[PDB]
């Protein structure tokens, strides 16, 4: 029941404290009780998120507590209801249990009201689970918020109502894998819980009373509060999380700036002025692009990288031991015995590598020499080392090296000998060196990308901007999202997001839609109406009419039955823009895309890297003592499990030799693997 703290980002760190498992001391998995238990129950309303849970095996077993949910003095989960009497709704709000709840006819949160008063004929209400259209007189309690039905990770997805639950589960889930961008943006369309999460998470640093700011630097802030207190707040700086992702503050206040209590002093690692800042807002065209987005694959405007948009700073921690041995103590010496000295440069530091150095794979973090071989020199090497000058030192190159596939640049080393300051030593271990390697990780073919409505795909091609589809004002698009990843999904919120975006873009605004309240289809077209001015209602004041290609499109558009035949080539477009689609020009030819394409702003997060799903490759290396099957080192990655299922794969194929060599030559054939190697060499 205890585990590593999820802290990929602040939100993930908060979801984890709000977790519920049935496993541990209570019956677990081997007995399953599937379909029961794992099923979302009629009593979960506002007690558990019906749409948050792990995918696959552990479904419905692990689960997350609904936003407004509360645990009473006994331990029973309570959701709040406001009592209503005689169709006159009171604010007097009660936290009923599961059982208390079954004693009443509570009504849904969106009953049309008239101040205190219900203005509805038929009122749509739960009666101990069963929904029934009823009369006001019969009501007794009412739902506080549409929100109270869902966890917090769920409550952060605008247009949830338009999003199918499956694909919105994925959203709730992937926000856990948001990894602080160094240009962390809060989203363009928000739900409301953005500020309130960042505070309750302790993502940002707030002011605990009214006062004037004394000092501000990257390091710390001193503030003088109205009572006379001058308290220093360190700005916890470039700190390492469990998962690597850098937690640390960044101040948003200047010197002698008078300030109110609870005002923002330092942003989170993922807060953009107290606002939960998990990803980045981007101009997305949705449409197929030459297969480059073939099955959930996604394409990327080079321009995203120059803006350091999806860059991310990652601290990686290495250790090295200095153990006592039966063959004599091993050392952490700068003097590794080999053939180079020009390849010891950044090292020098009496073992350790100098704080500041670049490291690629193979480079040495901490040099180490260990006694190995059992005293004597090899029957062959005894003849050998003599010729060179047989000191043949009984020490080996067990130096801590840069694991293959990138390291980065050093930020901090820690050299702990004997633990005499008050650090608990390890038995039979002399000393330990730590190193920390940081790296800014930009976006790259392979990097994965997600949105809160459950869109997840991998960056399959980073085109140059010379190629990207562009708007008439030359503004090219940032990301190209194939649309086939959408009917089947049934996550329309991603479109209700791309539209509103297209507005706020030109409207120079951002919005707050709330979970089941929020923007409706009329207001958005109406927002697009004002946005059509900014965009086009000033295209002619610069002296430019309409393009010879907009003529070409509008034809094909009105035939599609998109725009009115008869209306003016100008206001045909305005219609077409209120639909969300504009007119893109294929950045290559300069010709237009037949038919309109819906561009617009959408908010996207760079999903986080696990080292299991790091890029791996073995040619050959270590081998388990006992079974003598291939094994992992640190510089060496073991082989792939070749399970029964894959074995059949080739049998089926009549791949005779191939199978056998997977079953001998490349696993357990002690003799032949050596025999093989040589032959190949």
């Amino acid at each position: 029941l205890s585990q590593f703290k999820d802290e990929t980002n602040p939100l993930s760190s908060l979801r984890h404290k709000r977790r519920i498992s049935a496993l541990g001391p209570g019956g677990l998995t081997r007995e399953r009780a599937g379909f029961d238990v794992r099923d979302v129950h009629r009593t979960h309303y506002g007690r558990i998120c019906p749409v948050e849970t792990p995918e696959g095996a552990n479904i419905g077993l692990i689960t997350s507590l609904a936003a407004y949910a509360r645990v009473d003095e006994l331990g029973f989960i309570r959701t709040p209801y406001r009592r209503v009497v005689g169709g006159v709704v009171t604010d007097e709000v009660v936290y009923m249990t599961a059982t208390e709840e079954d004693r009443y006819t509570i009504a849904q949160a969106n009953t049309p009201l008239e101040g205190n008063r219900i203005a509805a004929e038929r009122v749509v209400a739960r009666r101990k689970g069963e929904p029934v259209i009823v009369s006001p007189e019969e009501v007794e309690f009412m739902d506080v918020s549409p929100k109270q039905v869902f966890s917090v990770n769920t409550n952060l997805i605008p247009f949830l109502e338009h999003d199918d639950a499956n694909r919105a589960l994925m959203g709730s889930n992937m926000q856990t894998q948001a990894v602080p961008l160094i240009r962390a943006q809060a989203p363009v369309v928000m739900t409301g819980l953005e500020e309130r999460v960042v505070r309750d998470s302790l993502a940002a640093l707030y002011a605990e009373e009214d006062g004037e700011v004394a000092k501000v630097d990257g390091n710390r802030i001193v503030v003088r509060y109205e009572d006379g207190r001058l308290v220093e707040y360190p700005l916890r700086r470039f700190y390492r999380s469990n998962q690597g992702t850098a937690l640390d503050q960044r101040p948003r206040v200047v010197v002698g700036q008078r300030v109110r209590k609870g005002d923002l002093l330092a942003d989170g690692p993922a807060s953009e002025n107290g606002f939960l800042a998990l990803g980045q807002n981007v101009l997305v065209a949705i449409m197929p692009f030459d297969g480059y987005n073939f099955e959930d694959a996604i394409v990327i405007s080079e321009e995203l990288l120059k803006r350091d948009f999806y860059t991310s700073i990652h601290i990686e921690r290495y250790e090295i031991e200095a153990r006592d041995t039966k063959l004599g103590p091993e050392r952490i010496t700068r003097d590794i015995p080999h053939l180079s000295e020009a390849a010891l440069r950044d090292l020098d530091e009496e073992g350790v590598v100098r704080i500041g150095a670049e490291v690629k794979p193979g480079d040495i973090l901490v040099g180490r020499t260990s006694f190995k071989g059992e005293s004597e020199p090899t029957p062959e090497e005894r003849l050998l080392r003599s010729i060179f000058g047989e000191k043949a030192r009984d020490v080996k190159d067990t130096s801590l090296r840069v694991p293959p596939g990138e390291g980065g640049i050093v930020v901090r080393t820690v050299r702990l000998r004997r633990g005499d300051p008050g650090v608990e030593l390890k038995p039979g271990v002399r000393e330990v060196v730590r190193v920390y390697v940081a790296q800014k990780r930009k976006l790259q073919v392979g990097d994965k990308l997600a949105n809160r409505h459950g869109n997840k795909g991998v960056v399959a091609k980073i085109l140059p901007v010379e190629d990207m589809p562009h708007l008439p004002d030359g503004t090219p698009v940032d990301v190209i999202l194939n649309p086939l990843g959408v009917p089947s999904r049934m996550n329309l919120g991603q479109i209700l997001e791309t539209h509103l975006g297209l507005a706020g873009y030109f409207l120079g605004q951002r919005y707050i839609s709330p979970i089941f309240d929020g923007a409706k289809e009329p207001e958005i077209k109406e927002l697009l109406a004002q946005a059509f001015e900014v965009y086009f209602g000033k295209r002619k004041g610069e002296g430019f009419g309409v393009d010879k290609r907009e003529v070409e499109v509008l034809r094909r558009a009105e035939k599609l039955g998109l725009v009115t035949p008869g209306k003016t080539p100008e206001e045909q477009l305005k219609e077409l823009f209120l639909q969300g689609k504009v007119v893109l020009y294929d950045g290559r030819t300069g010709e237009p895309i037949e038919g309109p394409i819906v561009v617009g702003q959408m908010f996207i997060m760079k999903l986080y890297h696990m080292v299991e799903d790091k890029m791996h490759a073995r040619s050959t290396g270590p081998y388990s003592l006992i079974t003598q099957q291939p094994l992992g080192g640190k510089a060496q990655f073991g082989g792939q499990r070749f399970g029964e299922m894959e074995v059949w794969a080739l049998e089926a194929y009549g791949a005779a030799h191939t199978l056998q060599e997977m079953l001998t030559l490349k696993s357990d054939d002690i003799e032949g693997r050596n025999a093989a190697y040589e032959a190949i060499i």
């Binding site: 929904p131 499956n166 009917p487 050959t620």
Partner: protein, 621 residues
Amino acid sequence: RVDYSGRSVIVVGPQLKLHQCGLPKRMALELFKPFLLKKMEEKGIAPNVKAARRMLERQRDIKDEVWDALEEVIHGKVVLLNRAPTLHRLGIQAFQPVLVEGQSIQLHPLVCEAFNADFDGDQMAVHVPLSSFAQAEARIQMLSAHNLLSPASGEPLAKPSRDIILGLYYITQVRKEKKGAGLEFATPEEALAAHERGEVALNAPIKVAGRETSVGRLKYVFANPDEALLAVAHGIVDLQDVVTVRYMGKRLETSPGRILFARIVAEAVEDEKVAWELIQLDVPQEKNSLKDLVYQAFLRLGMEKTARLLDALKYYGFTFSTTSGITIGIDDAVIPEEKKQYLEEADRKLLQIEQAYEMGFLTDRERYDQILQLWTETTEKVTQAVFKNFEENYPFNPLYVMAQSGARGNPQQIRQLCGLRGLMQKPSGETFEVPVRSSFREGLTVLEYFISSHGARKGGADTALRTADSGYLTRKLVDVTHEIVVREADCGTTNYISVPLFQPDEVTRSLRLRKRADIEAGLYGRVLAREVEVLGVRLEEGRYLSMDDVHLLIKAAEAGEIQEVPVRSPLTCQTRYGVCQKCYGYDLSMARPVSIGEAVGIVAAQSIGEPGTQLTMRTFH
């Protein structure tokens, strides 16, 4: 665990050809290391191997002269690739490295459908076959451009899929134009006149005293094929408009894109004769119409010339799809006017039912069971109108197309979007008597949303209940089929079985022809036990049932000349501990008879447990 292996994330590789993959050179140089060290010794890159290996144990010490030696090793060779879960033969497929930069493996998008991998970060593992025999095996019998058809069906399994269809459909498809109606007068230019003052559309349906024609067919008469596209070039017309063109002496009434396609195929097969007599130049192309095109081009033209066709078709689908410019803005969710009118009625009949229960005439379950049936018929009525709409008013609506073209999404999916999600079951099983009335375009109720999460749960606790282990069936089927190999050619036994062509399901014993597919299933590529003489043709004892023949005998059974077929099975085989090649029949992945030595039983097992993850878990009706 295996000693020449590796793994990475997969990014799609459109530019790739059918028999190759994008591989990190970074990866290869581990994998191929020892092979590389030699070439380094063969070249001046190293004095010796220890120095050559030394040259590499630090990334930055690796001289770039080296990479020109990796490409050199690789040339000729192939890697393998497999993907969890390996649920059949094709979870492993051989290709030729194309060394690419970066940390991921680009992968052709046709083998996608086989491997069952998409790109929300599915990873693949790569192995190297070592022995000059293994690579031999790998290239001749695992290369992704020789395994075109499927071991389970016979049907091709590398087909136009997504974007590839969406592309092809849209440029073959011809258009319908409404503002023109049905008009009947003198042709001369009197026809063109109405179009000059625009009262008639252009590809409007029109019939003057003469024939049935567009406008359309008249105004634009093309001499040769390339004179047509030369017009669309100058944007005087599209490949969607209907038009008259002359070819090989014929005078045809199609579109230009029909030809464009009828050409795309022509060229990539190097055989204009056998090319044009395979194209259905009479309908838009889609999932099936190509799936067939392929199959034909696979018996008619070699497996090798079939590989080209697939990339050519893949290349165009893409290109064309891009510029074709579909998308999906909220406005493409085109709700029909009928949804009210129906929910009006349904709402008012629910009155009647409630009055008849309030009265005493129906019992509880009698009431319950009534209401639900209503909605069943209703949820259909909506789903129906939604489509007539998309056929009569928006026959090019993105959703509508992807739907129809087999590029994406089914009836029930489009419904939940436009129509109405409908009946939701409870968690205990019993259906809610109240359905989700909204759609996804309308946005569900805070409580319509809850309702629909119980079966939303179940629809997960049924696949995850087979994710942890449903290699379960195949385990079992392999445990009892592995030994069966095709040992003898002819295992020489008079006896057989007779596949029926008629079903007794109008019941009881009310006869009827079994769906085509059903037959194809039991007859395709079997070997004839006794000379069948049907439809003025003797299909001679010991024939190999060509698919053309599975179609002929059906024609013959529709014709009324035959009801059973004497076919030779494994069910009555007499190979000592195995199955003879004639008692099996075709290969199925190739359209030949099965070659001896084939792991037929293993194929059997897989093929039957491949699709186990898509059999509805427990009884839900």
